[PDB]
Each structure stands twice: as structure tokens, then as C-alpha cells.
Amino acid sequence: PTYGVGYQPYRVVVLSFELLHAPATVCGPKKSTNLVKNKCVNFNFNGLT
Amino acid sequence: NCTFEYVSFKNLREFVFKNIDGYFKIYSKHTPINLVRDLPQGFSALEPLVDLPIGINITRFQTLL
Numbered sequence: 512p513t514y515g516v517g518y519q520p521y522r523v524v525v526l527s528f529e530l531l532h533a534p535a536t537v538c539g540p541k542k543s544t545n546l547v548k549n550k551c552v553n554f555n556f557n558g559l560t
Numbered sequence: 561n562c563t564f565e566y567v568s569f570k571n572l573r574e575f576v577f578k579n580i581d582g583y584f585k586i587y588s589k590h591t592p593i594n595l596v597r598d599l600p601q602g603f604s605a606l607e608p609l610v611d612l613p614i615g616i617n618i619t620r621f622q623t624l625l
């Protein structure tokens with residue numbers, strides 16, 4: 512613990528991203544709005560625009 | 561090695577298996593029956609169970625019993 516910062520321990524995580532012909536098993540989270548009935552709106556349900 | 565994993569005569573249990581663009585699709589139906597030696601003559605449609613993003617190719621299969 513008495514070491515200077517260049518000698519002190521650092522933890523490291525390297526996050527590696529893979530993309531192939533095989534389908535996406537991981538995605539960033541997709542947020543949702545409140546719902547408006549009886550008004551003209553743009554909409555998106557499960558990617559159906 | 562380890563991989564992806566998932567958890568969910570008197571009768572006829574009918575199933576369909578197909579593999580398209582990296583997804584494995586399973587459909588099924590159950591019915592009462594009154595015939596032993598053949599598939600019962602009539603119509604009902606198999607509903608989807610699961611649609612799994614496994615990427616694996618298939619050319620052969622077998623039953624467990």
C-alpha cells in the first residue's frame with residue numbers, strides 16, 4: 512500500500528464485442544414511453560413503426 | 561464444452577422442428593385420439609412454443625426414450 516501510483520495495483524476489465532453471421536445474443540437496453548390513446552401519433556411497438 | 565441453455569394410445573403429441581438464419585423454431589399441439597396404428601384423419605394447426613437464437617447447423621437428429 513506504500514507504493515507510488517505507477518507501482519500500485521490497478522484492476523482492468525477489457526470488454527470485447529463479437530459480430531458474425533450468427534444472431535445477436537447481446538443488446539443494449541431499449542427504453543419505452545408512456546402510451547397515448549385517441550390521438551394521432553407516431554408509434555413503435557417491438558420495432559413495428 | 562458448455563454453451564447457451566434454457567428452461568421452460570390415449571393422446572397424440574405433434575411437433576414441428578425447423579432451422580432458419582440461425583434460429584431454431586419449435587411448434588406443437590396435443591389432442592385426444594381414438595386410433596392406435598396411424599395419425600388420426602382431421603385438421604388442427606400447431607402453435608409456436610419457442611424461437612431460439614442458437615446459430616448451430618443441423619443435418620441429423622434422434623429421439624430420447
Ligand SMILES: *[C@@H]1O[C@H](CO)[C@@H](O)[C@H](O)[C@H]1NC(C)=O
Nearest residue numbers: 531532533614615616617618
Ligand atoms: C453453419 O454452416 C455455414 C456453411 O453452410 C457456416 O458458414 C457457418 O459458420 C456454420 N455455423 C456454425 C455455428 O458453425
